[PDB]
Design a protein around this nucleic acid. Structure first.
Ligand SMILES: Nc1nc2c(ncn2[C@H]2C[C@H](O)[C@@H](COP(=O)(O)CP(=O)(O)OP(=O)(O)O)O2)c(=O)[nH]1
Ligand SMILES: [Mg+2]
Ligand SMILES: [Mg+2]
Ligand code: NA
Ligand code: NA
Length: 326
DNA sequence: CCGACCGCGCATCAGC
DNA sequence: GCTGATGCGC
DNA sequence: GTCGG
Protein backbone atom coordinates (compact mmCIF):
# COMPACT_ATOMS: atom_id res chain seq x y z
CA UNK A 1 0.00 0.00 0.00
CA UNK A 2 2.92 2.32 -0.70
CA UNK A 3 1.49 2.77 -4.21
CA UNK A 4 -1.97 1.56 -3.19
CA UNK A 5 -3.67 4.62 -4.64
CA UNK A 6 -2.11 3.73 -7.99
CA UNK A 7 -2.95 0.03 -7.66
CA UNK A 8 -6.54 0.44 -6.44
CA UNK A 9 -7.15 2.73 -9.43
CA UNK A 10 -5.73 0.19 -11.88
CA UNK A 11 -7.65 -2.75 -10.48
CA UNK A 12 -10.85 -0.68 -10.45
CA UNK A 13 -10.07 0.06 -14.09
CA UNK A 14 -9.49 -3.65 -14.73
CA UNK A 15 -12.72 -4.67 -13.02
CA UNK A 16 -14.59 -2.22 -15.27
CA UNK A 17 -13.08 -3.58 -18.51
CA UNK A 18 -13.91 -7.17 -17.52
CA UNK A 19 -17.33 -6.64 -15.93
CA UNK A 20 -18.64 -3.78 -18.11
CA UNK A 21 -16.57 -3.44 -21.27
CA UNK A 22 -16.18 -7.27 -21.48
CA UNK A 23 -12.68 -6.54 -22.74
CA UNK A 24 -10.90 -9.34 -20.92
CA UNK A 25 -7.44 -8.40 -22.25
CA UNK A 26 -7.79 -4.77 -21.16
CA UNK A 27 -8.60 -6.41 -17.83
CA UNK A 28 -5.30 -8.33 -17.85
CA UNK A 29 -3.19 -5.42 -19.03
CA UNK A 30 -4.39 -3.38 -16.03
CA UNK A 31 -3.81 -6.34 -13.72
CA UNK A 32 -0.23 -6.87 -14.91
CA UNK A 33 0.40 -3.17 -14.46
CA UNK A 34 -1.07 -3.09 -10.94
CA UNK A 35 0.92 -6.22 -10.08
CA UNK A 36 4.16 -4.66 -11.35
CA UNK A 37 3.61 -1.41 -9.48
CA UNK A 38 2.65 -3.36 -6.35
CA UNK A 39 6.01 -5.17 -6.52
CA UNK A 40 7.85 -1.92 -7.29
CA UNK A 41 9.78 -0.83 -4.19
CA UNK A 42 9.48 2.99 -4.36
CA UNK A 43 6.65 5.45 -4.02
CA UNK A 44 5.91 6.55 -7.58
CA UNK A 45 6.14 10.27 -8.36
CA UNK A 46 5.51 10.39 -12.11
CA UNK A 47 3.82 8.59 -14.95
CA UNK A 48 7.06 8.60 -16.93
CA UNK A 49 8.77 6.92 -13.97
CA UNK A 50 6.20 4.10 -13.85
CA UNK A 51 6.35 3.60 -17.64
CA UNK A 52 9.83 2.02 -17.36
CA UNK A 53 8.06 -0.96 -15.81
CA UNK A 54 6.80 -3.67 -18.16
CA UNK A 55 3.03 -3.65 -18.40
CA UNK A 56 2.88 0.13 -18.04
CA UNK A 57 2.50 1.87 -21.38
CA UNK A 58 1.78 5.44 -22.35
CA UNK A 59 -1.93 5.50 -21.45
CA UNK A 60 -1.47 4.00 -17.96
CA UNK A 61 1.39 6.51 -17.54
CA UNK A 62 -0.95 9.44 -18.20
CA UNK A 63 -3.56 8.16 -15.74
CA UNK A 64 -0.88 7.80 -13.06
CA UNK A 65 0.11 11.39 -13.89
CA UNK A 66 -3.47 12.59 -13.37
CA UNK A 67 -3.99 10.64 -10.16
CA UNK A 68 -0.77 11.93 -8.61
CA UNK A 69 -1.77 15.48 -9.61
CA UNK A 70 -5.37 15.36 -8.35
CA UNK A 71 -5.66 12.37 -6.01
CA UNK A 72 -8.43 11.27 -8.38
CA UNK A 73 -9.01 9.91 -11.88
CA UNK A 74 -11.73 11.58 -13.98
CA UNK A 75 -12.49 8.41 -15.95
CA UNK A 76 -13.25 6.62 -12.68
CA UNK A 77 -15.60 9.24 -11.19
CA UNK A 78 -17.74 9.00 -14.35
CA UNK A 79 -17.81 5.20 -14.11
CA UNK A 80 -19.11 5.48 -10.55
CA UNK A 81 -21.84 7.98 -11.51
CA UNK A 82 -23.20 5.69 -14.24
CA UNK A 83 -26.05 3.69 -12.68
CA UNK A 84 -25.92 1.15 -15.51
CA UNK A 85 -22.22 0.28 -14.94
CA UNK A 86 -22.54 0.12 -11.15
CA UNK A 87 -25.56 -2.14 -11.69
CA UNK A 88 -23.72 -4.41 -14.14
CA UNK A 89 -20.60 -4.35 -11.99
CA UNK A 90 -22.57 -5.15 -8.84
CA UNK A 91 -24.45 -8.03 -10.45
CA UNK A 92 -21.10 -9.64 -11.31
CA UNK A 93 -20.43 -9.82 -7.54
CA UNK A 94 -23.05 -12.60 -7.39
CA UNK A 95 -21.48 -16.03 -7.71
CA UNK A 96 -22.63 -17.40 -11.06
CA UNK A 97 -23.41 -14.06 -12.77
CA UNK A 98 -20.58 -13.19 -15.11
CA UNK A 99 -20.40 -10.07 -17.30
CA UNK A 100 -22.64 -11.61 -19.96
CA UNK A 101 -25.52 -12.44 -17.59
CA UNK A 102 -25.15 -9.22 -15.53
CA UNK A 103 -25.56 -7.19 -18.74
CA UNK A 104 -28.67 -9.13 -19.80
CA UNK A 105 -30.37 -8.72 -16.42
CA UNK A 106 -29.79 -4.95 -16.19
CA UNK A 107 -30.80 -4.64 -19.85
CA UNK A 108 -34.06 -6.34 -18.87
CA UNK A 109 -34.33 -3.95 -15.92
CA UNK A 110 -32.93 -6.03 -13.04
CA UNK A 111 -30.79 -3.46 -11.26
CA UNK A 112 -30.88 -4.22 -7.53
CA UNK A 113 -30.50 -6.92 -4.94
CA UNK A 114 -34.25 -6.51 -4.53
CA UNK A 115 -34.99 -7.14 -8.21
CA UNK A 116 -32.89 -10.33 -8.25
CA UNK A 117 -34.79 -11.71 -5.24
CA UNK A 118 -38.13 -11.19 -7.02
CA UNK A 119 -36.76 -12.86 -10.19
CA UNK A 120 -35.10 -16.04 -8.88
CA UNK A 121 -36.88 -17.77 -11.79
CA UNK A 122 -34.52 -16.05 -14.21
CA UNK A 123 -31.47 -17.64 -12.49
CA UNK A 124 -29.88 -21.06 -12.79
CA UNK A 125 -29.09 -23.09 -9.67
CA UNK A 126 -25.53 -21.76 -9.37
CA UNK A 127 -26.73 -18.16 -9.52
CA UNK A 128 -29.59 -18.87 -7.10
CA UNK A 129 -27.07 -20.12 -4.53
CA UNK A 130 -24.83 -17.06 -5.01
CA UNK A 131 -27.88 -14.92 -4.31
CA UNK A 132 -28.98 -17.03 -1.35
CA UNK A 133 -25.57 -16.36 0.30
CA UNK A 134 -24.63 -13.12 -1.44
CA UNK A 135 -23.95 -11.26 1.79
CA UNK A 136 -21.82 -14.04 3.31
CA UNK A 137 -19.63 -14.43 0.24
CA UNK A 138 -18.83 -10.73 0.34
CA UNK A 139 -17.18 -11.39 3.68
CA UNK A 140 -13.64 -12.49 4.32
CA UNK A 141 -12.67 -15.63 6.20
CA UNK A 142 -10.20 -14.90 9.05
CA UNK A 143 -7.24 -17.21 9.08
CA UNK A 144 -8.41 -18.55 12.44
CA UNK A 145 -11.66 -19.81 10.96
CA UNK A 146 -9.66 -21.22 8.03
CA UNK A 147 -7.74 -23.25 10.63
CA UNK A 148 -10.97 -24.72 12.02
CA UNK A 149 -12.34 -25.33 8.52
CA UNK A 150 -9.07 -27.07 7.67
CA UNK A 151 -9.15 -29.29 10.75
CA UNK A 152 -12.67 -30.38 9.79
CA UNK A 153 -11.75 -31.11 6.17
CA UNK A 154 -8.62 -33.09 7.03
CA UNK A 155 -10.21 -35.08 9.86
CA UNK A 156 -13.16 -35.96 7.67
CA UNK A 157 -11.09 -37.14 4.70
CA UNK A 158 -8.88 -39.17 7.00
CA UNK A 159 -12.15 -40.94 7.96
CA UNK A 160 -12.96 -41.84 4.35
CA UNK A 161 -9.50 -43.25 3.62
CA UNK A 162 -6.15 -42.76 5.34
CA UNK A 163 -4.30 -42.63 2.00
CA UNK A 164 -5.95 -39.37 0.91
CA UNK A 165 -3.61 -36.41 1.22
CA UNK A 166 -5.39 -33.07 1.57
CA UNK A 167 -3.71 -29.66 1.26
CA UNK A 168 -5.25 -26.21 1.73
CA UNK A 169 -3.80 -24.01 -1.02
CA UNK A 170 -4.94 -20.58 -2.39
CA UNK A 171 -4.46 -17.47 -0.29
CA UNK A 172 -4.41 -19.57 2.89
CA UNK A 173 -1.22 -21.41 1.91
CA UNK A 174 0.35 -18.10 0.89
CA UNK A 175 -0.05 -17.09 4.54
CA UNK A 176 -2.95 -14.65 4.24
CA UNK A 177 -4.46 -13.45 7.50
CA UNK A 178 -7.87 -13.70 5.82
CA UNK A 179 -9.05 -15.57 2.72
CA UNK A 180 -11.78 -15.18 0.15
CA UNK A 181 -12.57 -18.90 0.28
CA UNK A 182 -11.05 -22.29 1.08
CA UNK A 183 -9.15 -24.12 -1.68
CA UNK A 184 -8.42 -27.80 -1.02
CA UNK A 185 -6.16 -30.02 -3.05
CA UNK A 186 -6.82 -33.78 -2.84
CA UNK A 187 -4.53 -36.64 -3.84
CA UNK A 188 -5.21 -40.37 -3.49
CA UNK A 189 -2.68 -43.05 -4.56
CA UNK A 190 -5.28 -44.78 -6.79
CA UNK A 191 -5.88 -41.63 -8.89
CA UNK A 192 -2.77 -41.33 -10.97
CA UNK A 193 -1.81 -40.28 -14.48
CA UNK A 194 -1.66 -44.03 -15.17
CA UNK A 195 -5.33 -44.74 -14.41
CA UNK A 196 -8.46 -43.73 -12.49
CA UNK A 197 -8.53 -46.90 -10.39
CA UNK A 198 -11.58 -46.55 -8.18
CA UNK A 199 -13.20 -43.44 -9.78
CA UNK A 200 -15.63 -42.02 -7.13
CA UNK A 201 -12.59 -40.65 -5.28
CA UNK A 202 -13.82 -37.06 -5.17
CA UNK A 203 -17.51 -37.98 -4.77
CA UNK A 204 -16.77 -40.01 -1.63
CA UNK A 205 -15.09 -37.03 0.01
CA UNK A 206 -17.83 -34.60 -1.00
CA UNK A 207 -20.42 -37.02 0.37
CA UNK A 208 -18.74 -37.45 3.76
CA UNK A 209 -18.46 -33.64 4.06
CA UNK A 210 -22.19 -33.27 3.38
CA UNK A 211 -23.00 -36.09 5.81
CA UNK A 212 -21.41 -34.15 8.69
CA UNK A 213 -23.17 -30.96 7.58
CA UNK A 214 -20.00 -29.15 6.58
CA UNK A 215 -20.75 -28.92 2.85
CA UNK A 216 -24.21 -27.37 2.52
CA UNK A 217 -24.61 -26.65 -1.20
CA UNK A 218 -23.10 -27.66 -4.53
CA UNK A 219 -22.45 -25.11 -7.25
CA UNK A 220 -20.74 -27.54 -9.62
CA UNK A 221 -19.22 -30.99 -9.26
CA UNK A 222 -17.31 -33.07 -11.79
CA UNK A 223 -14.95 -36.02 -11.43
CA UNK A 224 -11.95 -33.91 -10.38
CA UNK A 225 -13.39 -30.47 -9.43
CA UNK A 226 -15.99 -29.59 -6.80
CA UNK A 227 -17.35 -26.07 -6.32
CA UNK A 228 -19.69 -25.63 -3.39
CA UNK A 229 -20.56 -24.04 -0.07
CA UNK A 230 -19.59 -24.95 3.51
CA UNK A 231 -20.01 -23.70 7.07
CA UNK A 232 -18.32 -24.09 10.45
CA UNK A 233 -20.50 -25.52 13.26
CA UNK A 234 -21.56 -22.91 15.82
CA UNK A 235 -22.34 -23.45 19.51
CA UNK A 236 -25.70 -23.32 21.09
CA UNK A 237 -26.40 -19.61 21.21
CA UNK A 238 -23.77 -17.91 19.04
CA UNK A 239 -24.89 -16.28 15.86
CA UNK A 240 -23.98 -18.90 13.29
CA UNK A 241 -20.93 -18.58 11.04
CA UNK A 242 -21.40 -17.27 7.48
CA UNK A 243 -21.50 -19.94 4.83
CA UNK A 244 -18.37 -20.01 2.70
CA UNK A 245 -17.23 -20.97 -0.76
CA UNK A 246 -15.10 -24.12 -0.83
CA UNK A 247 -13.24 -25.61 -3.79
CA UNK A 248 -11.88 -29.16 -3.87
CA UNK A 249 -9.64 -30.27 -6.70
CA UNK A 250 -8.59 -33.92 -7.16
CA UNK A 251 -5.13 -34.11 -8.84
CA UNK A 252 -3.26 -37.30 -9.98
CA UNK A 253 -0.83 -38.14 -7.17
CA UNK A 254 2.22 -38.14 -9.48
CA UNK A 255 1.41 -34.53 -10.48
CA UNK A 256 0.94 -33.20 -6.96
CA UNK A 257 3.68 -30.60 -7.27
CA UNK A 258 2.40 -28.92 -10.41
CA UNK A 259 -1.13 -29.12 -9.01
CA UNK A 260 -0.06 -27.66 -5.66
CA UNK A 261 1.75 -24.88 -7.53
CA UNK A 262 -1.24 -24.00 -9.71
CA UNK A 263 -3.64 -24.20 -6.78
CA UNK A 264 -1.42 -22.07 -4.51
CA UNK A 265 -1.28 -19.14 -6.93
CA UNK A 266 -1.94 -16.31 -6.85
CA UNK A 267 -3.81 -16.23 -10.14
CA UNK A 268 -1.61 -13.38 -11.33
CA UNK A 269 1.55 -15.13 -10.09
CA UNK A 270 0.45 -18.12 -12.17
CA UNK A 271 -0.04 -16.15 -15.37
CA UNK A 272 3.36 -14.52 -14.96
CA UNK A 273 5.07 -17.82 -14.13
CA UNK A 274 3.45 -19.53 -17.07
CA UNK A 275 4.41 -16.62 -19.34
CA UNK A 276 8.10 -16.72 -18.34
CA UNK A 277 8.01 -20.50 -18.80
CA UNK A 278 7.03 -19.92 -22.42
CA UNK A 279 9.94 -17.50 -22.88
CA UNK A 280 12.12 -20.36 -21.65
CA UNK A 281 10.54 -22.92 -23.98
CA UNK A 282 8.18 -24.77 -21.59
CA UNK A 283 4.46 -24.82 -20.90
CA UNK A 284 3.10 -25.33 -17.39
CA UNK A 285 -0.37 -26.37 -16.30
CA UNK A 286 -1.72 -27.99 -13.13
CA UNK A 287 -0.66 -31.42 -14.42
CA UNK A 288 2.76 -31.05 -16.03
CA UNK A 289 5.57 -28.85 -17.27
CA UNK A 290 6.56 -29.75 -20.86
CA UNK A 291 8.99 -28.31 -23.41
CA UNK A 292 7.37 -26.84 -26.52
CA UNK A 293 7.76 -28.13 -30.04
CA UNK A 294 8.16 -25.56 -32.81
CA UNK A 295 5.03 -27.30 -34.16
CA UNK A 296 2.62 -25.97 -31.55
CA UNK A 297 2.39 -29.30 -29.72
CA UNK A 298 4.15 -29.64 -26.39
CA UNK A 299 6.74 -32.24 -25.52
CA UNK A 300 6.61 -34.94 -22.90
CA UNK A 301 6.13 -34.19 -19.18
CA UNK A 302 9.46 -33.59 -17.45
CA UNK A 303 10.03 -35.20 -14.03
CA UNK A 304 9.18 -33.09 -11.02
CA UNK A 305 9.63 -33.87 -7.33
CA UNK A 306 9.21 -30.42 -5.76
CA UNK A 307 7.72 -27.05 -6.52
CA UNK A 308 11.28 -25.71 -6.79
CA UNK A 309 12.01 -28.21 -9.59
CA UNK A 310 9.43 -26.29 -11.65
CA UNK A 311 10.99 -22.91 -10.87
CA UNK A 312 14.35 -24.44 -11.90
CA UNK A 313 13.39 -25.42 -15.45
CA UNK A 314 12.30 -21.86 -16.19
CA UNK A 315 15.38 -20.58 -14.40
CA UNK A 316 13.83 -18.83 -11.40
CA UNK A 317 14.97 -19.20 -7.89
CA UNK A 318 12.41 -20.58 -5.49
CA UNK A 319 9.62 -18.43 -4.15
CA UNK A 320 8.02 -19.37 -0.85
CA UNK A 321 4.21 -19.23 -1.19
CA UNK A 322 3.97 -16.00 0.83
CA UNK A 323 6.00 -14.22 -1.86
CA UNK A 324 3.56 -15.30 -4.59
CA UNK A 325 0.78 -12.74 -3.83
CA UNK A 326 1.03 -10.31 -6.67
C1' DC B 1 1.67 -0.89 -37.00
C1' DC B 2 -1.99 -4.75 -36.46
C1' DG B 3 -2.53 -9.17 -33.68
C1' DA B 4 -1.18 -11.92 -29.25
C1' DC B 5 -2.04 -12.08 -24.64
C1' DC B 6 -1.88 -18.73 -18.83
C1' DG B 7 -4.26 -23.00 -18.72
C1' DC B 8 -8.16 -25.69 -17.72
C1' DG B 9 -12.88 -27.94 -15.06
C1' DC B 10 -17.83 -27.83 -15.20
C1' DA B 11 -22.35 -26.33 -17.22
C1' DT B 12 -24.96 -25.08 -21.26
C1' DC B 13 -26.18 -24.82 -25.76
C1' DA B 14 -25.69 -25.18 -30.93
C1' DG B 15 -25.00 -28.01 -34.71
C1' DC B 16 -24.99 -32.44 -35.85
C1' DG C 1 -24.69 -38.83 -27.76
C1' DC C 2 -20.52 -35.89 -29.86
C1' DT C 3 -17.52 -31.53 -30.98
C1' DG C 4 -16.65 -27.18 -30.34
C1' DA C 5 -18.14 -22.69 -28.52
C1' DT C 6 -19.26 -19.84 -24.73
C1' DG C 7 -20.00 -18.49 -20.10
C1' DC C 8 -18.36 -18.60 -15.47
C1' DG C 9 -15.34 -20.19 -12.62
C1' DC C 10 -10.21 -22.06 -10.24
C1' DG D 1 -3.78 -1.62 -23.02
C1' DT D 2 0.83 -2.97 -23.91
C1' DC D 3 4.47 -5.05 -26.35
C1' DG D 4 6.42 -7.50 -30.14
C1' DG D 5 6.60 -9.86 -34.55
N1 LIG E 1 -3.35 -20.35 -13.82
C1 LIG E 1 -4.37 -19.79 -13.15
N2 LIG E 1 -4.58 -20.16 -11.85
C2 LIG E 1 -5.62 -19.56 -11.27
C3 LIG E 1 -6.45 -18.61 -11.86
N3 LIG E 1 -7.42 -18.21 -10.93
C4 LIG E 1 -7.17 -18.90 -9.81
N4 LIG E 1 -6.07 -19.74 -9.98
C5 LIG E 1 -5.45 -20.64 -9.01
C6 LIG E 1 -4.53 -19.83 -8.12
C7 LIG E 1 -5.41 -19.51 -6.98
O1 LIG E 1 -4.65 -19.13 -5.82
C8 LIG E 1 -6.16 -20.79 -6.81
C9 LIG E 1 -7.45 -20.58 -6.02
O2 LIG E 1 -8.16 -19.50 -6.64
P1 LIG E 1 -9.10 -18.53 -5.83
O3 LIG E 1 -9.68 -19.19 -4.55
O4 LIG E 1 -10.24 -18.08 -6.69
C10 LIG E 1 -8.16 -17.08 -5.34
P2 LIG E 1 -6.91 -17.18 -4.05
O5 LIG E 1 -5.53 -17.06 -4.64
O6 LIG E 1 -7.02 -18.48 -3.23
O7 LIG E 1 -7.29 -16.02 -3.03
P3 LIG E 1 -8.66 -15.77 -2.19
O8 LIG E 1 -9.55 -14.74 -2.84
O9 LIG E 1 -9.39 -17.09 -2.12
O10 LIG E 1 -8.21 -15.23 -0.76
O11 LIG E 1 -6.42 -21.23 -8.20
C11 LIG E 1 -6.19 -18.26 -13.22
O12 LIG E 1 -6.87 -17.43 -13.83
N5 LIG E 1 -5.13 -18.90 -13.81
MG1 LIG F 1 -9.18 -18.75 -2.78
MG1 LIG G 1 -11.41 -20.94 -4.66
NA1 NA H 1 6.66 0.18 -19.97
NA1 NA I 1 -18.67 -13.85 -8.12
Amino acid sequence: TLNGGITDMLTELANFEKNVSQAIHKYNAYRKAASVIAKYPHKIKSGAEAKKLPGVGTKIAEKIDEFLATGKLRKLEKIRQDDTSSSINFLTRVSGIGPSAARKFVDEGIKTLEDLRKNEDKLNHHQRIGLKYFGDFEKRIPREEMLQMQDIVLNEVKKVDSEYIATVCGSFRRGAESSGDMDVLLTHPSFTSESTKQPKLLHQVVEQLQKVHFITDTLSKGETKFMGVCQLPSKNDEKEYPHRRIDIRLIPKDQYYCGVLYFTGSDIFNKNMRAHALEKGFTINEYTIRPLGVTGVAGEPLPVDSEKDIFDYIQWKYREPKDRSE
